Paper text:
One of the phosphatases responsible for plant phytochrome dephosphorylation and thereby increased activity is the phytochrome-associated protein phosphatase 5 ([name]). Studies by Ryu et al. have shown that the PP2A domain of [name] dephosphorylates the NTE of AsPhyA and AtPhyB, whereas the TPR region binds to the C-terminal histidine kinase-related domain of AsPhyA. A C-terminal inhibitory motif blocks together with the TPR region the active site of the PP2A domain, where two catalytic manganese ions are bound.
We crystallized AtPAPP5 in a monoclinic crystal form that resulted in a dataset at 3.0 Å resolution. The AtPAPP5 structure shows the characteristic bilobal shape of a type 5 serine/threonine phosphatase with two manganese ions bound in the active site. Three TPR repeats (TPR1: V10-L42, TPR2: W50-V76 and TPR3: S81-L110) are linked via a long helical linker (P115-T173) to the PP2A domain (L174-N484). Here, Mn2+ ion 1 is tetra-valently coordinated by amino acids D257, N289, H338 and H413, whereas Mn2+ ion 2 interacts with amino acids D228, H230 and D257. This partly occupied chloride (molecule A: 59%, B: 65%) replaces a phosphate anion that was observed before in the active site of the isolated PP2A domain of HsPP5. The AtPAPP5 structure represents the autoinhibited state, in which both the TPR region as well as the C-terminal inhibitory motif (K471-N484) block the active site and deny access for putative substrate-like phosphopeptides.
Numbering used by the authors: 5 to 484
Amino acid sequence: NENSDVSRAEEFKSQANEAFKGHKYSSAIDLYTKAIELNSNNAVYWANRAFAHTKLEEYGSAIQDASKAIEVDSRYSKGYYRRGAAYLAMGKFKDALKDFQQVKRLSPNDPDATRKLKECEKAVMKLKFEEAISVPVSERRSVAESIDFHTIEVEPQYSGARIEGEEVTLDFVKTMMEDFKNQKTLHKRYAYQIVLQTRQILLALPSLVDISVPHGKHITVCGDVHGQFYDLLNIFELNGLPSEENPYLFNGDFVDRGSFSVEIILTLFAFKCMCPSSIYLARGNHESKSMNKIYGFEGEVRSKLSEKFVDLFAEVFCYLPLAHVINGKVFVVHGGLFSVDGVKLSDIRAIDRFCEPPEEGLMCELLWSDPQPLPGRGPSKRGVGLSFGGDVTKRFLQDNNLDLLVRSHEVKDEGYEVEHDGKLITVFSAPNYCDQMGNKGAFIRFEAPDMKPNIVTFSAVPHPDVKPMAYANNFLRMFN
Ligand SMILES: [Cl-]
Ligand SMILES: [Mn+2]
Ligand SMILES: [Mn+2]
């Protein structure tokens, strides 16, 4: 059957490349799929759809597409290049080393092939040391055990904000945010005060927090912000600062990727210190030593804070709750649902969350999952977690007497998308993601008692000339 039309397939490829130039990666993937359907022996099509997949952080789909590209042409170096870029993007340095070994073997005198190979060799042995000294955080002394914040002297020439006494006050938070806005810094004493007080608050919280919004009051659910501090300031300017009267739920992924991650996490933690009922912080996948070590937050901390804040921030992130339930009706996780059925809220509440997210179990799945339009389950596009359909959402909701599922974790054009017949809503509060996506951000206000989700969208604001991934892993920087 010679029924493949190369002309129509090349028409789809150019259309997909045009959508690629315009950062319309989902449309590009669709057009590459149509191109592949009409011609599956062109490895360039597979490599391009893989490239578009990595742009959407769909690294599993990327690896699979690049693998089919390699299957088509053994000597197509761009297939191995794309697969290794996807592996490198998700931290699998050894697999990246394999694919970049192959990339050099094909083009043997190309300077960049040997360069990326020597780069990956340095990275894998560096990772060998890092992995050899890896110890579970629950078997380690807390940083709080060896640092009392009252002991830290503040030199009189420090011009930034000061916490007088034990209490974090709204006046200090406003001064801290204005200093952060002008690219100033907070003293180590007050950073330690904030983070150590936050450690106290979070460790006494269950893994699933029941949030009670009484009759007539409201709450704002926010999605990923990934270190875009100036868009966080925009959210607060458009919707009001966190307060007992105007509470916030931030659905994980506060840091990494964006280059103002320290300022966000210090602002969010301080608001929690000031009035705990004024803000609720769920955990994301990027509140993890695995992610922060390579995606910017850890390097941002080492630059603006010190090296002990790295372990302290990791420990505090391990204490973050995994989920929230608003008025016993609205279920808010970051990632999604699970590979098994019959999971009740009691199961989530009882999770021993004080560890780095494993590669298996309820914790990993609720932090990494994505919804799919078709019913059922399927392999994760990210290679971590799973894809769950509308039947999974509906069963979980009726099983738990819940009305709605709210989640984030995935970028959206308008900052939101309603799926699963109005039972799942993705919310994403990082507009113009990575300074290149061009999307709007969004947040959802919930007013009691009827709990109708009032979605509000917003656009990005300017910020100082600090490029994304600035403090991130060097090798991950020189791609995209
Ligand atoms: Cl993410
Ligand atoms: Mn996420
Ligand atoms: Mn995210």
